[PDB]
Amino acid sequence: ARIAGINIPDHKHAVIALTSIYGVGKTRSKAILAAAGIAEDVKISELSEGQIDTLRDEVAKFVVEGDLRREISMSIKRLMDLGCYRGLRHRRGLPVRGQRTKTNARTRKGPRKP
Amino acid sequence: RPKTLFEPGEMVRVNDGPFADFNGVVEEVDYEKSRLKVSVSIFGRATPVELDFSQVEKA
Amino acid sequence: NQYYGTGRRKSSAARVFIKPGNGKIVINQRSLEQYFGRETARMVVRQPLELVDMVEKLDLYITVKGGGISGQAGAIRHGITRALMEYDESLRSELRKAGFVTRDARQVERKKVGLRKARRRPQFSKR
């Protein structure tokens, strides 16, 4: 079941590929799990079109896929166009959710640069 | 019935009890507790004691 | 006498109504097999329950109060010791020789100032 992404279920769970596609979270995964109510560790042969349609309508009803790049792009772009520092400080790439970057936040900053 | 009407804040002094010749001011009454809360001076000691009209006889 | 629960170990006190009969352990009107019958470490707490060797004909209903599981086992064991000395005093010497009449006074040492645990000190920088 490939919808608006790059990932596919393969004799495994739909939910891991679904949460690997950006633009969503895992509450869609838990909701598809509760809607199916079956073991998804079984083989993906005879993948159900009912599963495909419920996956599609759940994605469409909630925040559709591809919107994370959309949100970060308009955030950085609109504040860069308007000249303000909120999107500039998202471009700089350091944490502004409230986090310490004095020696932490290496996940943002990457490998350490001497 | 003597004193069948009950008035909050009414002062009664019991001469038989240890409360005699003692004066106090009732700032707070706990209606949510459903028991009357007065910092009663008893044995020369003022402590908050829960009380009821059936519990103590009115003077 | 009625053989009852005596004695303490860690933070427990024994309430066993041990009585002549086939020994199948019932806890709070419910079975060992329902509570933790096939649990591993049930056997090694039940071995100090048996280790007084007067369990071979004694039915056990065990509702030892308070504390952890091995301490509860030690309380039960100490209770059967003290009840069997209350029954007859010739077998006091053999429980003393085996070492079961001893209460194990070992207990949790307290937390301490400038230190994470009872003995555990902060990691010390030489510089």
Binding site: M74, R78, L79, L82, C84, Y85, R86, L88, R89 | - | -
Partner: protein, 79 residues
């Protein structure tokens, strides 16, 4: 992330913003209180957040509604 009983607005800013909207001929509005959510009445105005002795003027648009006034305004400087 914040309350839903009411969207907070500063009362002095609400008075000066409705006065600016009613007049239609206004300069930048100087405000020291940076902690106000932008109403849709504010669109079409520059409202000045307090940074330093210097001036930060923000022309608030249709998108910048749910955000507070000081998000667009930098308090610290760096390379």
């Amino acid at each position: 992330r914040s309350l839903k009983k009411g969207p907070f607005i500063d009362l002095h800013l609400l008075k000066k913003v409705e006065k600016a909207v009613e007049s239609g001929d206004k300069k930048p509005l100087r405000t020291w209180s940076r902690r106000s959510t932008i109403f849709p009445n504010m669109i079409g105005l520059t409202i000045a957040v307090h940074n330093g002795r210097q001036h930060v003027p923000v022309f608030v648009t249709d998108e910048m509604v749910g955000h507070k006034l000081g998000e667009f305004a930098p308090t610290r400087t760096y390379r």
